[model samples]
Target chain A: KMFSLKKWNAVAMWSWDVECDTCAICRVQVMDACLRCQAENKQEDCVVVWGECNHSFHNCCMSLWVKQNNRCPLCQQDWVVQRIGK
Target chain B: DYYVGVASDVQGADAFDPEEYQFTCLTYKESEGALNEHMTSLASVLKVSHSVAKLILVNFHWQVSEILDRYKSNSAQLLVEARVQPNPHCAVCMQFVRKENLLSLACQHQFCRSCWEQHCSVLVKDGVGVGVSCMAQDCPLRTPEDFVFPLLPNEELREKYRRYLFRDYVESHYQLQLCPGADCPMVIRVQEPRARRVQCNRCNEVFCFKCRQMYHAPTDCATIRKWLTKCQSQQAQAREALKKYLFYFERWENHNKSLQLEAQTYQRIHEKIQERVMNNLGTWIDWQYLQNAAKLLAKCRYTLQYTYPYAYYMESGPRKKLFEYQQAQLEAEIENLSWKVERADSYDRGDLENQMHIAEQRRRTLLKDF
Candidate 1:
């Protein structure tokens, strides 16, 4: 069945809202996300992830930063996060 | 109060060996039956603690001396092993010699497993480890142990054995066991590395290698990933030929419909003009008008018929050819991938065995020295 234009437009708007909330990089929200990813549901234990902005990062992501290179690939910023115990 | 259930194959493999060499763990608490679902199941990783249990069992497998000699003292793992006398006269930078059953190489020449390992590594860096002669000049290439050697103890070998095995078990098995399909209910068994090509087989659905997308391949002749991609990109490079055919079919149907409608309109106009001619110019105009109409009708039918073969280019015919080419290319890629998988698998097995052997020797030598 052909959808009425008005009905279709309303459904589309709801979808847009759902997308904004869940999108990794929504235009309205700025997230200090890690340069690399870990498994989902691991957010609580995630370590401080420093970006080129000289922020801190999770201890686990160090391997990722080294393997992918130390620069904040996103902002092209240099990363200077040091291991806490090291 | 962990209940000792009848041993499962998982636990039995390590359970059946002599208590001196065997290892096991308390996998479940009888009181936690209700909470068991929320707790992590008895996993191979738990073996790290289980090794300590094994060491304890080796020292006290049997109960009390005759009757009242129940009091125990030092509780370290007990086993017979080799010992070494440090030589002050030796000029070598490193001075330790030890060996055991599993860790010691075929050669009798013995050093502490760790020391020998470091020496071997040095030789490896020099590209001489695989075929280098024994460390001593008088020793033959094959006399790896006769020149400078150490002996190790069984108890030490036991500790290293469990440490090495448990490490390998966890490394090889650490990964998600759930099926990657975005909407699939069945959890995929990731029991082995071959899980990459595993499928439901009964549902006839191919699992996506990337997102674990699931799709009906039997009906659509498309892979899970390919089907998902088709929704986003109607004209994928592989589907390019098929798209052209579909376009042709639609265009031809429209052209035919318009031609038929035009012919009917022309007939109606001819009928009206003929009626006027009968009242004025009479039947003379009738024959010429009829001839022209027939010619136009024939041309329209012929055009439609001529273009029917072009539908092959726009239909499954060209798409089939593209599919064939893609299948051949994909087959080659799969072959290459399998070869790479096999090579990596072989290297992994080789490396693990080497480590286990080295570690075993080291454990025995350490125990013997003590």
Candidate 2:
């Protein structure tokens, strides 16, 4: 049987292919694997990589960083908080 | 472990005679040892720098005899072409860098270390290490191993460029062929090259040595390549060509699907067979032949399906007629075997075994000729 135009509903769902937590460059959460392997159930292959900045990221998250990722904004070492006006 | 029952074919893979000169499967570390041996020998013989010797050997396709011949014939041209001597250009990007801060290919195409590093780093991301060309006006020379290493200060870029060099060395070296499997680190080293079938023990992928396609016989590598081109490279839907393509494509599609479907079928078969054995109906060993029959059906059907593509690519001649003739019989027998294998409980042991035998028999003869 042929039918004409009718009312319809549109639906969609999504999840980030990359996720975030405290790590600045990788923006990954603590203890859980990096976003690459986190959803892949490959937590066994993960390591919580701590750097000179004291900002802990899963090894794979920081692993893709190039030379341009010089600023350790998430690493907690760079911030010397000042109350200059006070 | 009981659930993951083994298929003998997947484990042992296809067998070919080792009476022919066999190849060695080298690991990543073992391959580096092999590379070092070659480099050291070449450097010792030529009285050149080790890095320069690497350039000569790589440019010469790792053929020592060729390098030795060209050495006396035209050493200057050989050195020049291999990018051994650097040109006398004392400039790049108007930089007033120190003399210690520069590196050069044999052509002496000098740039500041950072410029060279960044250039090589960009090529590292894009190339297979074969095309890391010198960046000079109207000059095309190669940058060798050590040249790129010191420049790539980042560990990640160094590792990637290092991996690419191994592939370059293997591909250039006459005796070596890298395993075509994805991320497979094994390299096959042969004494003499032949267009024979080689199976990787690690990946269990059977491919033609001369051309890395899944082992297709009754059709040689060049013919198989033509057949592959036939499967790809096509145009619009309305053309009669599209219909012909769709006909063959649908069968290949279904036949591929059948392998996965039979995989699911046998997954159920394992459970059903357990219940059959679990109940007082039959001994487990008596029903073991069902697994054997299922595996053979898949193997022969796989060959039968490939012949369909080979058939389409073949011209309308007597050879095509004979191939199609044998292919039809094998297909018929495999279908018969599949039906019997599915109806495991109802099947007579005698009939199931006979069909498996005949299907593989048909497959062997078809592969034997044409």
Candidate 3:
């Protein structure tokens, strides 16, 4: 599977940033061994943002991200860099 | 009991206030009055200790939040791939990619489509093979285990798409004999990346450094690259068979006898790969059909411009709407073609043949003189 590879580094061509660690809306832990909500890491060499929330997620997890309230699931911050455009 | 809302509601959304930002329990009631009564009762009941009330409220939010967030959105939530500059083709499968898809390989082979669709999207099978594979024919470069998860399309996929239509059209059509017969010649120069001189395997000719052309093998200007890989006829069973088959299939026989039937079978298989290559090369989608349909519809839409023998100048809203409907249908066809190209980019060589067969059939059936 492409999701099981070395974590994203800052130098790869494609880059991404995590949006949340826990459910920002539901206060449920977003990280950890999730069932039906588990996030898999990508193997493609890419640039990625090291989220301070300690949860590494895909860039799409943030952009096009819809939530009734805007906040990081882990830190509850309304701001998180999750998209990179060319 | 499920509820879903932003955390900013409790944390002031903008600024956290120590006093006003105290945890509040959000509960539901049959009516507004009943809800007010419940809050009033709780205010008085928990009046004994403010710390206990805060603790209870925190717990209440946690419980209610999970309950309120019960109904999942369509597909949990529509996903998007965060692709800033996605590769035009899947490096491994030699196919084009659509949107919101990716292939991660530790070998630095970042492909566009998910070739391992079953494993990636379905049951997590183990130890089959990890990460993405090198797209170069049989390259074994794989993504290391650690970097795999983050590279996936994720909850919302970050799909990168590049539409260089005008540029591609110009370069492909205008250019002649692309770059020394090897390598992508659009911009990335072959000479700079490597040496200028190269030998042609065919005819065993020595190519000159000054001009990118073939010369006699006895010449000394040829400088062959270590990485040059040419199709060896010895190992190419299918290709060899195709060559023989076509020769026999095409020859016309005497007395109304022709190998048309045999040619049809061979043609079927050959068309499969051809269609696959066309899609992988990022050629126009629905161009044939859309161009035809667009022309047809445009004729009716701008009937005034063209003076046919029969004048069709009457204002027909129904006909106009019909054209509009046709426009939407054509647009949908374009989208479907895009999806097919994107999906096919990461197809395996064998699977590509299968898909190409489907594509050929689809085109033949859908379009006239495909």
Candidate 4:
């Protein structure tokens, strides 16, 4: 009983319904860390900002983007910041 | 009444109103939405991809009707050419990449996105975003905004790209024309297509939509150009021709100088005039009358300026004689009105009103005759 399944280590995997295959500006996967954040080892700050236009990009990437243009990088619509999630 | 032109004959076209013309004013987003819808419909009808449809539509200057008309002959080649491989080697960079890693424009020229981005950045930064074309040599396919917008790295490039698209869109659409004012951002969209005078809503600068110059109504382009050439050409002019040229040129130059003077004095005088009207306990009509009369002076001055060129090349006949008589009448009346308006504080109200009406009547008569 002591060496049963409960004693063994466990692992779990999760997936999301990501619309964009890659960030339009950074060209990185929505599920992955943005290149800048990845290089800087700041994965926590790289939350995904999914635009109402159905386009998504890393928060770090999008924040840098709003400084340049106030629209979504892909659709060129007003970039409304929606859900901020890991 | 004097300051106001002939009440019945005045064209009242000095003020520009977008609603007066038949056009669908579209902001940037709406324009893009319509373009996207067109792309989608065209793609479905032709059984081609959105990318392919965009390429064809852009080449035809987004004229969907033209594309549909010419579809059978050229669309097949365009659609076939637009077929891109998922992992095709970029011809320029020689890099084999995944489909997502590659950027395919309307021309279906698939190159690595990085390579395409770099190329577009260079062109856009140099203010040549309008010339962005496919990487393939001799490929006449220019990249459309949908393809270029996503590939551009920075905001400045995106803005330049947007402006280029807008400029092309206005130039291509039969109903649209960019306002001819030097710093104007307005685009005038008319209901019908022809050489007509358009007053810009943004700048209030009236211009000929055909020549994109100062409005020259009742005057055709060919005659105006001939008169200008005669004035400028080194070729010897006969005595009559020289006399005629100097007559128009001197008057044209006079009006132009007065225009410059009015512009410089506009601000200082506007405030003082407003104050004077307020101090007199003037009604809204009085305030409005003075403002309207000032505007009339500017407008009539412009018309009076161009009448010279019109009169210069106009053939000798009864019509020409009438035109000249009206021109003289308008010129004298305009000067009188200009004098009264410049000294609005001292002029008798009744006299000023009467003069404005007389001047405006003369202007309308001349414009009608021309």
DockQ (0 to 1) for model 3: 0.01
Chain B TM-score by candidate, in order shown: 0.18, 0.73, 0.14, 0.61
Deviation of model 2 at B211, angstroms: 5.7
State residue B344's C-alpha deviation in candidate 1, in Å. 59
TM-score against native, each model: 0.16, 0.62, 0.12, 0.52
CAPRI rating of model 3: incorrect
Candidate 4 residue B111 C-alpha distance from true site, Å: 9.8
State the lDDT of candidate 2 residue by residue for B1-370, as single tens digits.
8656677535222254222347668788888998899889988887877878988888878888888889889888888867766444346567588888777765656777777767777877886676877787767677667766777777867888777878888888888888999989888878877776677879987787778777765456787677668662344545678788898888888888887867887797798789888887978788898777777777766767767766777777646645655566567766666767775457677666556655655666665533
lDDT of 4 by residue, B45-84 (tens): 8776576566566556566676676666775554444332
Highest TM-score scorer: 2
DockQ per candidate? 0.01, 0.00, 0.01, 0.00
Q: State residue B318's C-alpha deviation in candidate 3, in Å.
A: 99
Clashes of each: 22, 11, 50, 13
Off by over 4 Å in 3: A1-86, B1-88, B91-95, B98-110, B116-136, B150-370
Worst 10 residues of 4 chain B by lDDT: B79-88
Displacement of the residue B123 alpha carbon in candidate 4, Å: 4.3
Model 1 alpha-carbon drift over 4 Å, by segment: A1-86, B1-103, B106-111, B116-370
Model 1 per-residue lDDT tens digits across residues B66-129: 1113222312112111001111111233654432512432334443445444454354344331
As for lDDT, the candidate ahead, 2 or 3, is 2
- Candidate achieving the largest lDDT: 2
